[PDB]
Design a protein around this ligand. Structure first.
Ligand SMILES: Nc1ncnc2c1ncn2[C@@H]1O[C@H](COP(=O)(O)OP(=O)(O)O)[C@@H](O)[C@H]1O
Ligand SMILES: Nc1ncnc2c1ncn2[C@@H]1O[C@H](COP(=O)(O)OP(=O)(O)O)[C@@H](O)[C@H]1O
Lengths: 181, 178
């Protein structure tokens, strides 16, 4: 319990999200909540890059170009929310966007290409089983490299847990639960 | 080579009634979609697993008279066995309005087995907890949830579990159509 506010982790994010959104020509309303939520000081340097990766994913793969969102009947401006809070005895961190959602079709194609599953087993996979493929080491693009697989490995190294939720054209929500002690 | 799932379903109503009677449980058993077709190669493999799920619902799910009353629930419990085609899969569901899977019990067993520690246990999602039931050798015993999963997978199928405390449990199995 040598704690510090998660703001030490969150502070650099607004400017980075702003620049990233500009680089990929996306309109992003970035909201951070609960920056006062405290966490183990030893988590600060390990959780920073993983969270940044999730934010990048939201802006790059999630939030759609203004013209695409309109065709979908959604506001031109996309919304990306990073939040932290205390739940029970954990620090819960969420990264949520109202983007296009994870393309499960593509994940299955990747799973098959990487020999992680036979095509005959792909047809009956549940949504959660499909999304879980993102946590298999080596699944992310081969760039110290980033990727959801690395995010999960880091979260597990902190004795924590991670879950993903997503609905086509609705959005994506990643939740990380870290132990306080 | 397709046959109606009634090939598998027909013996369940009598077996459910018999089970409920022996276990002193009041159960209204509802079977739906008996005409749903599935590959003939699945028939001799899915029978025992499904019966085990029905058995689980009656034994571990539906609570005894006094307990349901205490929870504000009708004395007669409900057990629904369903079959249908969804997407391009045969979907079979087993649902009860019983006590729900005891997630704390699982967590305690996980800690005892040394698979998880106290701190980690508190971070687990409900699906992660329920999932331990699929781990070979995790539970008792010789059909177990781990055996049900293996058989389903061997048919290139998938299985998932959903449960809410004191609400009930629902197990879904998806089998290939092609
Ligand atoms: N927020 C999101 N919205 C939509 N798709 C996403 C999101 N996050 C991840 N994805 C999808 O999941 C796949 C994997 O991301 P990741 O594990 O970071 O690997 P990579 O470097 O290969 O993209 C992505 O390539 C993208 O298709
Ligand atoms: N429908 C259900 N409602 C409540 N608990 C259940 C249900 N199905 C299974 N369980 C719980 O999950 C644990 C194991 O199920 P399983 O592996 O099928 O074994 P078994 O019935 O032989 O103990 C059970 O011991 C019980 O505690």
């Amino acid at each position: 319990s040598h704690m510090v506010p998660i703001s030490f982790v969150f502070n650099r994010f607004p400017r980075m999200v702003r620049d990233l959104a500009k680089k990929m020509n996306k309109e992003v309303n970035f909201i951070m909540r609960g920056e006062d939520t405290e966490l183990d000081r030893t988590f600060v340097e390990e959780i920073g890059e993983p969270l940044l990766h999730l934010l990048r994913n939201a802006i790059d793969h999630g939030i759609e170009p203004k013209e695409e969102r309109i065709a979908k009947g959604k506001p031109p401006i996309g919304t990306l929310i990073l939040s932290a809070r205390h739940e029970g005895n954990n620090v819960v961190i969420e990264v949520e966007d109202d983007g296009r959602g994870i393309d499960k079709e593509k994940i299955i194609r990747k799973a098959i290409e990487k020999g992680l599953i036979d095509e005959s087993k792909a047809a009956t996979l549940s949504d959660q089983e499909i999304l879980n493929f993102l946590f298999v080491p080596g699944f992310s693009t081969k760039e110290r490299g980033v990727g959801m697989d690395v995010v999960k490995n880091v979260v597990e190294s902190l004795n924590g847990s991670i879950s993903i939720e997503s609905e086509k054209d609705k959005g994506t929500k990643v939740t990380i639960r870290l132990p306080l002690t």
